[PDB]
Design a protein around this ligand. Structure first.
Ligand code: HEM
Length: 153
């Protein structure tokens, strides 16, 4: 359980991210694919991209980034009361896409790296600690759902 003070730090920096959802989406997925190439293999729709240049020019990848950040933003705004939002996400990622928990850890790392680079003034040590706590809560609850659904993860 996070304290109200910790949620405030998380939503304060997220408000800045919302000023340019598409741009943040691009930086995050590009950071992930470059740092962990194996994650790209899970997208039959993007597995052909060979360079950072091709990724940055992809309109479809940009669109998907917006979809992903909008879904994550809705969860964070619930401040822990996200049971209803997690069910459909857990089902599709465990049963259809087959995404291991380890890959959710990799994208959490990419999110923190991008926020640190673009928002240093609003992402100091205390704020980073609060964001890590929020993302750990997310992964913990998704993992529990994965188990109930029959996927090891
Ligand atoms: C930050 C956590 C993530 C969020 C909030 C998220 C959200 C979503 C959403 C909303 C969709 C579309 C609806 C659906 O199929 O459920 C989606 C699709 C998908 N996600 Fe995720 N996702 C996350 C992490 C990942 C990761 C780490 C991978 C793989 C490395 C992944 C792979 C996929 C794939 C393959 C699809 C289908 C794309 C397509 O072919 O159109 N997701 N995700």
């Amino acid at each position: 359980v996070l304290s109200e003070g910790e949620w405030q730090l998380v939503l304060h920096v997220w408000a800045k991210v919302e000023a340019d959802v598409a741009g943040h989406g691009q930086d995050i997925w590009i950071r992930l694919f470059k740092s962990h190439p194996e994650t790209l293999e899970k997208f039959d729709r993007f597995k052909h991209l060979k360079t950072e240049a091709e990724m940055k020019a992809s309109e479809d990848l940009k669109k998907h980034g917006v979809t992903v950040l909008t879904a994550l933003g809705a969860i964070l705004k619930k401040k822990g009361h996200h049971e209803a939002e997690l069910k459909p996400l857990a089902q599709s990622h465990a049963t259809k896409h087959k995404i291991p928990i380890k890959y959710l850890e990799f994208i959490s790392e990419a999110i923190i790296h991008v926020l640190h680079s673009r928002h240093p003034g609003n992402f100091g040590a205390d704020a980073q600690g609060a964001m890590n706590k929020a993302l750990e809560l997310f992964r913990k609850d998704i993992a529990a759902k994965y188990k109930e659904l029959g996927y090891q993860g």
